[PDB]
Amino acid sequence: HHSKGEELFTGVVPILVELDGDVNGHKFSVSGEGEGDATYGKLTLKFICTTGKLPVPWPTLVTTFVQCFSRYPDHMKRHDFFKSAMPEGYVQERTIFFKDDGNYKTRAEVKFEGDTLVNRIELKGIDFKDDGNILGHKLEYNYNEHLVYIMADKQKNGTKAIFQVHHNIEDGGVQLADHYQQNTPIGDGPVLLPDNHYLHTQSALSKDPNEKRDHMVLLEFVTAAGITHGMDELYKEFEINLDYILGLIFEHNRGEMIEEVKRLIRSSLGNRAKEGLVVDFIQQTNLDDLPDKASIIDAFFTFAQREQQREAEALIKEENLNEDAAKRYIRTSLKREYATENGTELNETLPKLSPLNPQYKTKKQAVFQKIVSFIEKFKGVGGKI
Amino acid sequence: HSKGEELFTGVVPILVELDGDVNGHKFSVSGEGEGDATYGKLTLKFICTTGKLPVPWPTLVTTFVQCFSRYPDHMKRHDFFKSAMPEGYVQERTIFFKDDGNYKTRAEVKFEGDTLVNRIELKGIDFKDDGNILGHKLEYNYNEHLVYIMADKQKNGTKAIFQVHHNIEDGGVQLADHYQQNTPIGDGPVLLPDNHYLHTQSALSKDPNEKRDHMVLLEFVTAAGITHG
């Protein structure tokens, strides 16, 4: 763990959201509840407008209605400010400029009140136009994905963020919402000050069909990334996580290695299918020989690559694939990181007979299904086949 | 889905020519390299042929070929960029630098023989002399961004709106809001997309043997935002 606050989010945590708002004098209240699971960057929240009709559209309020619930992958966990401020919490303030229209100004405390995470918000909006997209209710009931760019702010001992939301307008076009954001600790305890990075967020809006009131059901996933710049290759979160995990293998000096690989691989996402591969690697190499962090990485990819060839050679015989076609198809799939039933590359692998009757599926299906499984396991390993 | 798609199955060489005028400061830039739409990968080297580049290099990255985007199979229906090929498209932008001037750009993106060519006239006005642009205050670096694409039915093409964050050296951010239009040069049928975006990752560097003012760009562009058939 990087902070004591991090431990409070290892499981499912209940959430309350309370918002009082005022937009061009139209007052309103909103109550919200549900939960979040930071291991999966997941949020489920339901919001009711307790005062009747909401005078602004629901989507414009999503951002304002708990980033302590982002999924920081293991290799970046030292940059999770939001969790490190818990339980005392943090103050989150924002101005939100709707282009060609008014702005919201929001102040919130986000903190544990008991074993619940509470977000209490004051919202003042001004200078909105009556025929505008906000007060005129012209925004689609939907939501785009965004990158939330986060920078440290040493002076306030917390963070800044800047990002631009796209609210799709009904009948076409986009209404932009530039967010400026400040997050300051409530307490005086040690916090984690991040390097520049971002949060990748996805959100989906729905209606509860048994809810007579004005409301929004929200489902949202948030993953942190973008901690590294100047990359020679496409970001692949799971490749970076796997390197990191192997990192922990050099620095665990001196049977308990096999329980920590298992443990970290299992609460991480994306490399679950590589557990057996890494565990084999530990049980089959004198790790005291390999000197540093870069050399155990090279030792595992050389070994993962031998296993890659063995398992390709093995599947090819088990299903009696035409060798050349299979090796082309498999190579392409490894480079592209998925296998496709499209084209004719798959069909070219398929023989007239095979050793095993697929009982319940076609030949194509059986061969496809065994290869997708192989690709999942070895995506990223590299090497020749 | 489109006949233009067939032209992008392999490595395609690229030429980039730009003429630039920012606050009366003129400049030319030549660029070359390749694009593999299979991996969404671009490799490009840019040289200022006129001497010193009078704006920072990062500010020109977006201006310097989204037809090389990796569209996943279930999204190829939405790849306008390739569908307009080989006759190609016009790509127009305004890029608004916050608390500073704007660039306006007009470019033809098209095949010439076996080569994908991007030809750009760029004009910039109202820049501050000790602004982040003319004062060369921007980091030599780049952040990932999403590029939000929308159809434009009337102009038989697409629009895009997105915001680039240029890190100011020694603290803060200079934003750059991009408004973009893409229209086919040809009369042929093209593909009109449902809303989606392009995730764009860029790395900037220097060739150690080039003496001229220059930029090496390694970039990956992947389409996303739709998850069904």
Swiss-Prot record, chain B:
Changing F64M: In RSGFP4; increases fluorescence and shifts the major exitation peak to 489-490 nm. Changing M150T: Increases fluorescence at warmer temperatures such as 37 degrees Celsius. Changing V173A: In mut2.1; shifts fluorescence lifetime from 3.03 to 2.50 ns. Changing N195I: In mut2.1; shifts fluorescence lifetime from 3.03 to 2.50 ns. Keywords: Chromophore, Luminescence, Photoprotein. Gene3D superfamilies: Green fluorescent protein. Changing N195S: In EBFP1.2; shifts the excitation and emission spectra to shorter wavelengths and increases quantum yields compared to BFP. This is Green fluorescent protein. It comes from Aequorea victoria. The gene is GFP.
